[PDB]
């Protein structure tokens, strides 16, 4: 017993065809959080 | 004849996404249409092997003599 399919993505662009957005994925989002606590303590200078 | 099925000729060899229920077809392949309009520019078909999946309308051309 069959049923219709519902696409997970918009239709991709074919070869040779004119430009459009199509099935292209978005760029990676902004970076957040890191070794924030004791950052300057770890980076601290030393000489002989 | 009444209720005769619709056929398509592939323009370019397509490759299905994992989990998208897409139909991997070859350039110049013949398939029958099961759903010519599903949303987002897509369609559904059936091949020689009898497998179904989603296919872009921008990748296949619909044949004449449909009824």
From Swiss-Prot, chain B:
Homodimer, and homooligomer. Heterodimer with SNX18. Interacts with ITCH. Interacts (via SH3 domain) with TNK2, WASL and ACTR3. Identified in a complex with TNK2 and clathrin heavy chains. Identified in a complex with the AP-2 complex, clathrin and DNM2. Interacts (via SH3 domain) with DNM1 and DNM2. Identified in an oligomeric complex containing DNM1 and SNX9. Interacts with FCHSD1. Interacts with ADAM9 and ADAM15 cytoplasmic tails. Widely expressed, with highest levels in heart and placenta, and lowest levels in thymus and peripheral blood leukocytes. The chain holds residues 1 to 64 of 595 of the full protein. Residues 4-65 form the SH3 domain. It comes from Homo sapiens (Human). Ubiquitinated by ITCH. It is found in: Cytoplasmic vesicle membrane; Cell membrane; Cytoplasmic vesicle, Clathrin-coated vesicle; Golgi apparatus, trans-Golgi network. This is Sorting nexin-9. The PX domain mediates interaction with membranes enriched in phosphatidylinositol phosphate. Has high affinity for phosphatidylinositol 4,5-bisphosphate, but can also bind to membranes enriched in other phosphatidylinositol phosphates. The lineage of its organism: Eukaryota, Metazoa, Chordata, Craniata, Vertebrata. Belongs to the sorting nexin family. Involved in endocytosis and intracellular vesicle trafficking, both during interphase and at the end of mitosis. Required for efficient progress through mitosis and cytokinesis. Required for normal formation of the cleavage furrow at the end of mitosis. Plays a role in endocytosis via clathrin-coated pits, but also clathrin-independent, actin-dependent fluid-phase endocytosis. Plays a role in macropinocytosis. Promotes internalization of TNFR. Promotes degradation of EGFR after EGF signaling. Stimulates the GTPase activity of DNM1. Promotes DNM1 oligomerization.
């Amino acid at each position: 017993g069959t049923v219709n399919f519902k696409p997970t993505r918009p239709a991709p662009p074919p070869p040779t065809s004119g430009q459009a957005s199509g099935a292209s994925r978005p760029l990676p989002p902004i970076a957040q959080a890191l070794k924030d606590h004791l950052a300057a303590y770890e980076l601290s200078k030393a000489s002989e | 004849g009444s209720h005769m099925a619709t056929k398509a000729r592939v323009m370019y060899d397509f490759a299905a996404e994992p989990g998208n229920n897409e139909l991997t077809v070859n350039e110049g392949e013949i398939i029958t249409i099961t759903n010519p309009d599903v949303g987002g520019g897509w369609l559904e078909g059936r091949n020689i092997k009898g497998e179904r999946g989603l296919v872009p309308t921008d990748y296949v051309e619909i044949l004449p003599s449909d009824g």
